[PDB]
Amino acid sequence: QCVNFTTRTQLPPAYTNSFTRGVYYPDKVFRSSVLHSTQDLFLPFFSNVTWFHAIHKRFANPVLPFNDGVYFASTEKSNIIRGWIFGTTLDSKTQSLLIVNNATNVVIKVCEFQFCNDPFLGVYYHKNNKSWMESEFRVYSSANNCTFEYVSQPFLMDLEGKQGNFKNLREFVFKNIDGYFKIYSKHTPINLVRGLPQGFSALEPLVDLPIGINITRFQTLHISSSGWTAGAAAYYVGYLQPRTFLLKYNENGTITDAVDCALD
Amino acid sequence: AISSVLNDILSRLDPPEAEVQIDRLITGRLQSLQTYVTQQLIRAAEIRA
Amino acid sequence: AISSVLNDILSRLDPPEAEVQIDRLITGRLQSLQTYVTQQLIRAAEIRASANLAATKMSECVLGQSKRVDFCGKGYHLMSFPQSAPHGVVFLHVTYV
Amino acid sequence: SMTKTSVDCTMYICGDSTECSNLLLQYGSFCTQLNRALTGIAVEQDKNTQEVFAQVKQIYKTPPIKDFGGFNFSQILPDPSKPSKRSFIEDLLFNKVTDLICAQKFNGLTVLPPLLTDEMIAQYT
Amino acid sequence: PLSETKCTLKSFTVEKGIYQTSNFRVQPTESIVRFPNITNLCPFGEVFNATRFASVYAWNRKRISNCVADYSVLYNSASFSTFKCYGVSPTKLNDLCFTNVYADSFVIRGDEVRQIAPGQTGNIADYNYKLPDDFTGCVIAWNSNNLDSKVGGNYNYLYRLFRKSNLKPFERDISTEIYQAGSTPCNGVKGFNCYFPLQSYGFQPTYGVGYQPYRVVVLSFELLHAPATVCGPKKSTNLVKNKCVNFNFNGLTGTGVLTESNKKFLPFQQFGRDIADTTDAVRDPQTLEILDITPCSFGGVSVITPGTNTSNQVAVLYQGVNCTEVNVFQTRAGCLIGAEHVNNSYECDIPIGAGICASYQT
């Protein structure tokens, strides 16, 4: 709880490039064989995002500020990352947003929590009926004054442990528009060791969270209490900026190409 | 505007209030006259051709 | 104005207040419509100038034989073969060089 | 010729509105001037096809026995085997020059069809 | 139809030729609204039974989605002190489609009642909480001056009068501490021509309306692309395609002809648009269906008649529209009423279109 992990340490702020990352569906509009240009909070092409990783003797969970919006890049194997914790002071002084990933839906709880210095969720007793289910709460000691609660739509996830290079990839975007929280999700398998591969994918709408809380900083929920360790995963953090993209819509209503006109 | 006749506007509204309705008549007649002149320049190119 | 849809204006401002915002839409859309008509009339002079030139080439180059230089095309003209084309016409000229 | 367009002043500016239709009556004859202007264009665009495409009112046909002195006119002459009457050169002319017509009619912009069709223009040629 | 040309040409003599008079348009004969079954009902009457309402910044809210506000229990008819409404009433909210509905409960004064407007400014708007641009509902108020108000002012409830900046729609600040009041930051503790941001009610039962407490209930609405599952207690009205109707689909109200489309929409995409950024096709929220949105057919009306000194026979021409009402013939130009179809070819007298010409003969 209040005591961090024995393997927790601060990694140097290395940087890596995101080829096409930052592209998402701006709205629910369907279009076919047309070129539409929109402007919103985006991640510019060929940018630089922080290079972080967490393993079972190196664990890094820094607190990063949230201003113009944040981009999430999660490279996973057994899907260690269960979400992110949001809020202003990240304590009981104000509201705090959390994301709980059970590999079924996405649980969003906005309440007043007592913040532990190293948030964690106990996963124990793998001898019989593993199920990879979350049980104990090391994140918050107490809970009250809940102004918001939400449950997402069901999806599919594989929590089985694997070896070798990275496999699963989950790219999220979190932004604040007039108090409405629009989270956009994409999940695709990739072949990656370190850094980021060169590829193109579009992020589909995930959940709409009309909450309205102010968030000045965010921390990450990596989970898999000094005796508890973490799993093998890597995570990157981007920043949204007001850039104009030219999106190519195909006959199926998906983005097959993207062009950042503020770059070159 | 209230009336197309300027005398009806000058004899009714106050000088500060009349400036609102007079500007509507002038700007409208400027567009009506500019449209006429623009159409005459087009017919001028047709008759010179 | 507040919005381009008249239903959004009538559902918010009062009838006396809504007439002011609607007049902003009418004046702008009319000026936008007058601009379109003005551009079409200006482009109408070019399409008629090309039509009178095409009718002149159709008469002199196709029907007869024009001795005009650089009219029926480079070289001494012989015969012209017209061909139908979308929103226009294509002339195939036989020249002597 | 160019695409024939006809625009209604009321439907383009504000449609399905009775109160806005009364505000158009205060601005005068702008409907009459803009409608007759575009209508005058559609007429002149049709006169361009009559003064160019069809020079004479007598139709001439190609004789079945062809001795041209060595020339092959099958390229410039139309092909009767096609469902539409066009030549081998007009094959590329019509194909290389590019619904959007119905899309303009959805917003209140009427597109008038031409008087001389593709078959009638090809016959004059 | 001959006299319609006379009023168009401003003359009592109509020369031989084709003349345009009016513009034909098909009016919608039905209102088609199709949405799935009922899930839940919004707390319209559940928040009216509370003991008391919190302050302006403390407002309680309960989120019940699926539009479709509870129409069974309605206290909105002459049950309270005064009713100032905008848009449509809760009785009329059944004909509109909303995503999320927040039932808000707060207590304000008399001067702050008129300040409540959708997405507008005010003392409680840009400082405590601002209502979103999507609010079509009624502002319901009741007179608490004989209950909540006390002699010498009521300091129990609180509100923040000053803030460093104006709030955006759906934005809140609950901080009661000392912050920037005006445009010049005073750096914390009150002074330097700033004021204490938090304020209290001065409610006096003996003064006028402005100092009287009023309990106000506001229903927050969402007009965004998220579909609503229910419209009204009477929903369907039976969709029949190939007809001009007034439709409301997935929150988009329009008038046009409904046709079936084969387009495949993304499960996260409710409706499409064309190159002109206008409604193209929509998806059925009830079952799986793709409806192509086309506007109702319309066109110009041309009067084909010979000279006034020749004959009074008139041929009505409909340009680019099929005549479903109705010598009714159809050509590539459109429905032609009043003329006969001759298979023989003649010299063109009165041009129509697509190579069709009209003439007056035996």
Residue numbers in the entry:
A (entry chain A): 14 to 69, 77 to 241, 245 to 247, 255 to 294
B (entry chain C): 972 to 1020
C (entry chain A): 972 to 1068
D (entry chain A): 730 to 827, 848 to 874
E (entry chain C): 295 to 620, 641 to 676
Paper text:
The spike (S) glycoprotein of SARS-CoV-2 mediates receptor recognition and viral entry into cells. It forms homotrimers protruding from the virus surface and, once engaged with the host-cell receptor–human ACE2, undergoes a substantial structural rearrangement to fuse the viral membrane with the host-cell membrane. The S protein is also the primary target of the humoral immune response during infection. A large number of SARS-CoV-2 neutralizing monoclonal antibodies bind S protein, especially its receptor-binding domain (RBD), providing a basis for vaccine development.
We also resolved two cryo-EM maps of the Beta S trimer, including a one RBD-up open state (termed Beta S-open) and a transition state (termed Beta S-transition) at 3.5- and 3.6-Å resolution, respectively. For the Beta S-open, the angle between the up RBD-1 and the horizontal plane of S trimer is about 70.8°, slightly smaller than that of the Kappa S-open. Collectively, for Beta S trimer, the S1 subunit RBD-3 movement could be transferred to the central S2 helix bundle through contacting the HR1-CH hairpin, accordingly, S2 could also be involved in the collective motions with S1 movement, not seen in Kappa or WT counterpart.
